[PDB]
mmCIF file of C-alpha atoms in Angstrom:
data_model
loop_
_atom_site.group_PDB
_atom_site.id
_atom_site.type_symbol
_atom_site.label_atom_id
_atom_site.label_comp_id
_atom_site.label_asym_id
_atom_site.label_seq_id
_atom_site.Cartn_x
_atom_site.Cartn_y
_atom_site.Cartn_z
ATOM 1 C CA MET A 1 197.645 13.514 97.606
ATOM 2 C CA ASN A 2 198.588 13.911 101.120
ATOM 3 C CA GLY A 3 202.587 13.109 101.836
ATOM 4 C CA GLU A 4 201.313 12.018 105.601
ATOM 5 C CA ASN A 5 199.121 9.314 104.128
ATOM 6 C CA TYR A 6 202.606 7.588 103.237
ATOM 7 C CA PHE A 7 205.474 7.448 105.356
ATOM 8 C CA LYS A 8 209.227 7.183 104.662
ATOM 9 C CA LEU A 9 211.640 5.527 105.863
ATOM 10 C CA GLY A 10 214.194 7.957 104.718
ATOM 11 C CA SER A 11 214.375 11.698 104.472
ATOM 12 C CA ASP A 12 216.383 14.162 102.081
ATOM 13 C CA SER A 13 215.729 16.962 105.015
ATOM 14 C CA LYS A 14 217.564 14.726 107.854
ATOM 15 C CA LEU A 15 221.293 13.934 106.958
ATOM 16 C CA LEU A 16 223.120 10.687 109.078
ATOM 17 C CA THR A 17 226.162 12.495 109.015
ATOM 18 C CA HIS A 18 225.182 15.192 111.678
ATOM 19 C CA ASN A 19 222.945 12.514 113.390
ATOM 20 C CA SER A 20 226.489 11.009 114.626
ATOM 21 C CA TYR A 21 227.976 14.150 116.188
ATOM 22 C CA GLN A 22 224.659 14.157 118.286
ATOM 23 C CA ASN A 23 225.798 11.068 119.812
ATOM 24 C CA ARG A 24 229.095 12.259 121.222
ATOM 25 C CA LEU A 25 230.242 15.384 121.814
ATOM 26 C CA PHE A 26 233.406 16.649 122.387
ATOM 27 C CA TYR A 27 234.436 19.953 124.166
ATOM 28 C CA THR A 28 237.824 21.761 125.198
ATOM 29 C CA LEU A 29 239.326 22.849 128.135
ATOM 30 C CA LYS A 30 240.116 26.415 128.070
ATOM 31 C CA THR A 31 241.600 28.380 131.067
ATOM 32 C CA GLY A 32 239.457 30.204 133.507
ATOM 33 C CA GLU A 33 237.068 27.213 133.830
ATOM 34 C CA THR A 34 237.150 23.931 135.425
ATOM 35 C CA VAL A 35 235.728 20.170 134.702
ATOM 36 C CA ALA A 36 233.234 21.043 137.960
ATOM 37 C CA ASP A 37 232.278 23.840 136.520
ATOM 38 C CA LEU A 38 230.983 22.338 133.014
ATOM 39 C CA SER A 39 229.480 19.289 135.593
ATOM 40 C CA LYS A 40 227.567 21.893 136.905
ATOM 41 C CA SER A 41 226.240 23.254 133.754
ATOM 42 C CA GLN A 42 225.350 20.203 132.463
ATOM 43 C CA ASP A 43 223.531 19.089 135.635
ATOM 44 C CA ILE A 44 225.693 15.625 135.416
ATOM 45 C CA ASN A 45 227.304 13.610 138.355
ATOM 46 C CA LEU A 46 230.560 13.699 138.490
ATOM 47 C CA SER A 47 230.747 9.925 139.330
ATOM 48 C CA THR A 48 229.176 9.815 135.897
ATOM 49 C CA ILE A 49 231.898 11.653 133.985
ATOM 50 C CA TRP A 50 234.564 9.509 135.697
ATOM 51 C CA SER A 51 232.899 6.146 134.558
ATOM 52 C CA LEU A 52 232.686 7.300 130.838
ATOM 53 C CA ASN A 53 236.148 9.197 130.602
ATOM 54 C CA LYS A 54 237.874 6.102 132.862
ATOM 55 C CA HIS A 55 239.776 4.614 130.193
ATOM 56 C CA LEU A 56 241.118 8.255 128.957
ATOM 57 C CA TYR A 57 242.636 9.381 132.566
ATOM 58 C CA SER A 58 244.149 6.999 134.984
ATOM 59 C CA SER A 59 241.831 8.300 138.100
ATOM 60 C CA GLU A 60 239.923 11.074 139.295
ATOM 61 C CA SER A 61 242.929 13.446 140.519
ATOM 62 C CA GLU A 62 243.917 13.606 136.875
ATOM 63 C CA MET A 63 240.564 15.354 136.220
ATOM 64 C CA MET A 64 240.464 17.738 138.987
ATOM 65 C CA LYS A 65 244.267 19.006 138.481
ATOM 66 C CA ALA A 66 243.276 19.459 134.278
ATOM 67 C CA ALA A 67 245.021 22.400 132.558
ATOM 68 C CA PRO A 68 243.717 24.139 129.380
ATOM 69 C CA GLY A 69 244.271 22.292 125.906
ATOM 70 C CA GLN A 70 243.202 18.801 127.189
ATOM 71 C CA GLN A 71 239.521 17.079 125.893
ATOM 72 C CA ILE A 72 236.580 15.896 127.410
ATOM 73 C CA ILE A 73 233.975 13.193 126.367
ATOM 74 C CA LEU A 74 230.568 12.843 126.589
ATOM 75 C CA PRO A 75 229.060 10.151 124.923
ATOM 76 C CA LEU A 76 225.334 9.966 125.720
ATOM 77 C CA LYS A 77 223.527 6.619 125.222
ATOM 78 C CA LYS A 78 219.843 5.993 124.904
ATOM 79 C CA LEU A 79 217.766 2.749 126.107
ATOM 80 C CA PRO A 80 214.108 2.627 124.599
ATOM 81 C CA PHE A 81 214.087 -0.787 125.390
ATOM 82 C CA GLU A 82 214.361 -2.554 128.790
ATOM 83 C CA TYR A 83 215.415 -5.752 127.915
ATOM 84 C CA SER A 84 218.556 -6.362 125.510
ATOM 85 C CA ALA A 85 219.662 -8.657 122.601
ATOM 86 C CA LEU A 86 222.850 -7.980 123.520
ATOM 87 C CA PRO A 87 224.284 -8.453 127.190
ATOM 88 C CA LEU A 88 227.663 -7.768 127.719
ATOM 89 C CA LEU A 89 229.256 -9.311 130.755
ATOM 90 C CA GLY A 90 232.185 -8.108 132.644
ATOM 91 C CA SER A 91 232.240 -4.783 131.939
ATOM 92 C CA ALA A 92 234.815 -3.786 134.518
ATOM 93 C CA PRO A 93 237.341 -6.473 133.964
ATOM 94 C CA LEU A 94 239.782 -4.326 135.946
ATOM 95 C CA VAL A 95 238.524 -5.524 139.105
ATOM 96 C CA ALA A 96 238.065 -9.132 140.136
ATOM 97 C CA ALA A 97 234.701 -8.244 141.837
ATOM 98 C CA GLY A 98 231.455 -8.189 139.746
ATOM 99 C CA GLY A 99 227.440 -8.848 139.975
ATOM 100 C CA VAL A 100 225.852 -7.025 142.714
ATOM 101 C CA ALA A 101 227.929 -3.548 143.612
ATOM 102 C CA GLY A 102 227.287 -0.507 145.050
ATOM 103 C CA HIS A 103 226.164 -1.384 148.341
ATOM 104 C CA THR A 104 228.877 1.052 150.038
ATOM 105 C CA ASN A 105 229.956 4.066 148.608
ATOM 106 C CA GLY A 106 233.244 6.109 149.134
ATOM 107 C CA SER A 107 235.473 3.111 148.128
ATOM 108 C CA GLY A 108 238.294 5.510 146.739
ATOM 109 C CA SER A 109 238.500 6.882 150.519
ATOM 110 C CA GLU A 110 239.633 3.058 151.758
ATOM 111 C CA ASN A 111 243.150 1.315 149.740
ATOM 112 C CA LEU A 112 241.433 -1.910 149.832
ATOM 113 C CA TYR A 113 237.768 -2.640 149.199
ATOM 114 C CA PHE A 114 237.220 -5.707 152.009
ATOM 115 C CA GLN A 115 239.069 -2.936 154.644
#
């Protein structure tokens, strides 16, 4: 009679509610610490952080000038399978351009992408 012999899809020891917390972590900004400091500790690229929170803040400038009392969301996503059953097109509706992207860096420096 070995428990290992039989595998259970659900485990009492594991709580589903807690699992949801792992999906997204909320961190609060306190006086003395800067957004960049957070980025260093997490070993995450500032560009990535912006892409996620772009909906919360209008632009990167607002992030740089962040002050105490504001919140930052860190939502991590996992992709075990390279192929996705539900592919979404139009990730960036704000910009007409689509498909191939990233050929050039420092877009912010130029007001116009074309020039």
